[PDB]
């Protein structure tokens, strides 16, 4: 049962967005420019990671997509919020780890 | 048909996510939706 989570409702979980449209992803991901700029205590642990999983997730299958416009500015505004969060994540892990 | 499309194609993703934007994306978003 713990494998019919992992594996159906995983590649079943994973390909939700096999076809999902263009302009949503920038709506969605935007408001993850809300939520991602809220910091990491505020929203929490798999609230804060599982949302770079919707951006890691919401980069998925661009790379299966085509080039429009909206394809490379939003490749820009992912991949920076990405490494804004990367970057706060360690700054996060630092931040404790010479809490001693 | 989302026993045999849900279920059966992209629950294991067998095969790939792209082909249903691809053997289904013939203008059929109101069913994508």
Not at chain 1, 39 to 61: A, F, R, S
């Amino acid at each position: 049962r713990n494998n019919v989570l992992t594996t159906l409702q995983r590649n079943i979980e994973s390909t939700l967005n096999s076809v999902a449209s263009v302009k949503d992803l920038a709506n969605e991901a935007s408001k993850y420019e809300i939520i991602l700029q809220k910091g990491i205590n505020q929203v929490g642990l798999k609230q804060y990671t599982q949302v770079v999983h919707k951006l890691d997730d919401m980069l998925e299958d661009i790379q299966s997509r085509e080039e429009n416009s909206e394809f490379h500015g939003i490749l820009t505004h992912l991949e920076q919020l990405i490494k804004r969060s990367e970057a706060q994540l360690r700054v996060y892990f630092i931040s404790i780890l010479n809490s001693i | 048909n989302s026993t045999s499309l849900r279920k059966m194609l992209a629950n294991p993703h067998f095969n790939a996510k792209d082909f249903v934007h691809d053997k289904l994306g013939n203008a059929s978003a109101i069913t994508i939706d």
